[PDB]
């Protein structure tokens, strides 16, 4: 899988 | 929200990855619909071969926000273009800034 679901960290 | 040039309302996640990868350029980004959460959107940016994707949702009162980590203040924006402008700036908590719009 080339998609990574990330989250705003700041 | 067709007025968002980077918004691709008919593409899949896979199609989103191929468009970005085709740029060969880190920092290229687009917006698409989520294919897991109806009604939610995904802001997608290329970094070192992978597509870092941030789910973006509209409030019941119209504003926009990106999925945010635990213990971090969540930011809301009136206009989606405003959320997009914010994340084009350095050091805003995403993997690399939004740099090269992949437009319709």
UniProtKB/Swiss-Prot annotation, chain A:
Q: What is the effect of changing residue 5 to F?
A: Disrupts interaction with INPP5D/SHIP-1 and PTPN11/SHP-2, no effect on interaction with SH2D1A
| Segments carrying motif ITSM 1 | 3-8
Q: Which residues carry this modification: Phosphotyrosine?
A: 5
Protein location: Cell membrane
PTM description: Phosphorylated on tyrosine residues by FYN.
Q: In which tissues is it expressed?
A: Constitutively expressed on peripheral blood memory T-cells, T-cell clones, immature thymocytes and a proportion of B-cells, and is rapidly induced on naive T-cells after activation. Activated B-cells express isoform 1, isoform 3 and a cytoplasmic isoform. Isoform 4 is expressed in B-cells, primary T-cells, dendritic cells and macrophages. Isoform 4 is expressed in tumors of the central nervous system.
Q: Briefly state the protein's biological role.
A: Self-ligand receptor of the signaling lymphocytic activation molecule (SLAM) family. SLAM receptors triggered by homo- or heterotypic cell-cell interactions are modulating the activation and differentiation of a wide variety of immune cells and thus are involved in the regulation and interconnection of both innate and adaptive immune response. Activities are controlled by presence or absence of small cytoplasmic adapter proteins, SH2D1A/SAP and/or SH2D1B/EAT-2. SLAMF1-induced signal-transduction events in T-lymphocytes are different from those in B-cells. (Microbial infection) Acts as a receptor for Measles virus; also including isoform 4.
Q: Subunit comment for this entry?
A: Interacts (via cytoplasmic domain) with SH2D1A and SH2D1B; SH2D1A mediates association with FYN; SH2D1A binds to phosphorylated and not phosphorylated ITSM 1. Interacts (via cytoplasmic domain phosphorylated on tyrosine residues) with INPP5D and PTPN11; presence of SH2D1A facilitates binding to INPP5D. Interacts with MAP4K1. Interacts with PIK3C3, BECN1 and UVRAG; indicative for an association with PI3K complex II (PI3KC3-C2).
Q: What is known of its domains?
A: The ITSMs (immunoreceptor tyrosine-based switch motifs) with the consensus sequence T-X-Y-X-X-[VI] present in SLAM family receptors have overlapping specificity for activating and inhibitory SH2 domain-containing binding partners. Especially they mediate the interaction with the SH2 domain of SH2D1A and SH2D1B. For SLAMF1 a 'two-out-of-three-pronged' mechanism is proposed involving threonine (position -2), phosphorylated tyrosine (position 0) and valine/isoleucine (position +3).
Q: What is this protein called?
A: Signaling lymphocytic activation molecule
Q: Which organism is it from?
A: Homo sapiens
Q: What is the lineage of its organism?
A: Eukaryota, Metazoa, Chordata, Craniata, Vertebrata
Part of the whole protein covered? 277 to 286 of 335
From Swiss-Prot, chain B:
Coiled coil stretches, renumbered: none
The answer to whether the entry has keyword Calcium is no
Top-level taxon of origin = Eukaryota
Q: What is the effect of changing residue 99 to P?
A: In XLP1; reduced protein stability and strongly reduced affinity for SLAMF1, disrupts interaction with FYN
Region: Interaction with FYN SH3 domain; residue ranges are 67-92
* Result of altering residue 42 to Y: In XLP1; uncertain significance
What does changing residue 67 to G do?
In XLP1; uncertain significance
State which tissues express it: Expressed at a high level in thymus and lung, with a lower level of expression in spleen and liver. Expressed in peripheral blood leukocytes, including T-lymphocytes. Tends to be expressed at lower levels in peripheral blood leukocytes in patients with rheumatoid arthritis.
Effect recorded for residue 87 to S: In XLP1; reduced protein stability and reduced affinity for SLAMF1 and FYN
Q: Which effect does the record note for changing residue 102 to G?
A: In XLP1; reduced protein stability and strongly reduced affinity for SLAMF1, decreases interaction with FYN
Q: Which residues carry this modification: N6-acetyllysine?
A: 89
Self-association or partners: how does it assemble? Interacts with NTRK1, NTRK2 and NTRK3. Interacts with CD84, CD244, LY9, SLAMF1 and FYN.
This molecule's function is given as: Cytoplasmic adapter regulating receptors of the signaling lymphocytic activation molecule (SLAM) family such as SLAMF1, CD244, LY9, CD84, SLAMF6 and SLAMF7. In SLAM signaling seems to cooperate with SH2D1B/EAT-2. Initially it has been proposed that association with SLAMF1 prevents SLAMF1 binding to inhibitory effectors including INPP5D/SHIP1 and PTPN11/SHP-2. However, by simultaneous interactions, recruits FYN which subsequently phosphorylates and activates SLAMF1. Positively regulates CD244/2B4- and CD84-mediated natural killer (NK) cell functions.
Disease link:
Lymphoproliferative syndrome, X-linked, 1: A rare immunodeficiency characterized by extreme susceptibility to infection with Epstein-Barr virus (EBV). Symptoms include severe or fatal mononucleosis, acquired hypogammaglobulinemia, pancytopenia and malignant lymphoma.
Question: Mind telling me what this protein is named?
Answer: SH2 domain-containing protein 1A
Q: Which organism is it from?
A: Homo sapiens
Taxonomic lineage:
Eukaryota, Metazoa, Chordata, Craniata, Vertebrata
Give the gene that encodes this protein. SH2D1A
- Covered residues, full protein: 1 to 104 of 128
């Amino acid at each position: 899988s080339l998609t990574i679901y990330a989250q705003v960290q700041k | 929200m067709d007025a968002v040039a980077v918004y691709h309302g008919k593409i899949s996640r896979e199609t989103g990855e191929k468009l970005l990868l085709a740029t060969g350029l880190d920092g290229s980004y687009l917006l698409r619909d989520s294919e897991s959460v109806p009604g939610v959107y995904c802001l997608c940016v290329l970094y070192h071969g992978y597509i870092y994707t941030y789910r973006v949702s509209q409030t019941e009162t119209g504003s926009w926000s990106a999925e945010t980590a635990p213990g971090v203040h969540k930011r809301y924006f009136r206009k989606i273009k405003n959320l997009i402008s914010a994340f084009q700036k350095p050091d805003q908590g995403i993997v690399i800034p939004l740099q090269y719009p992949v437009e319709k």
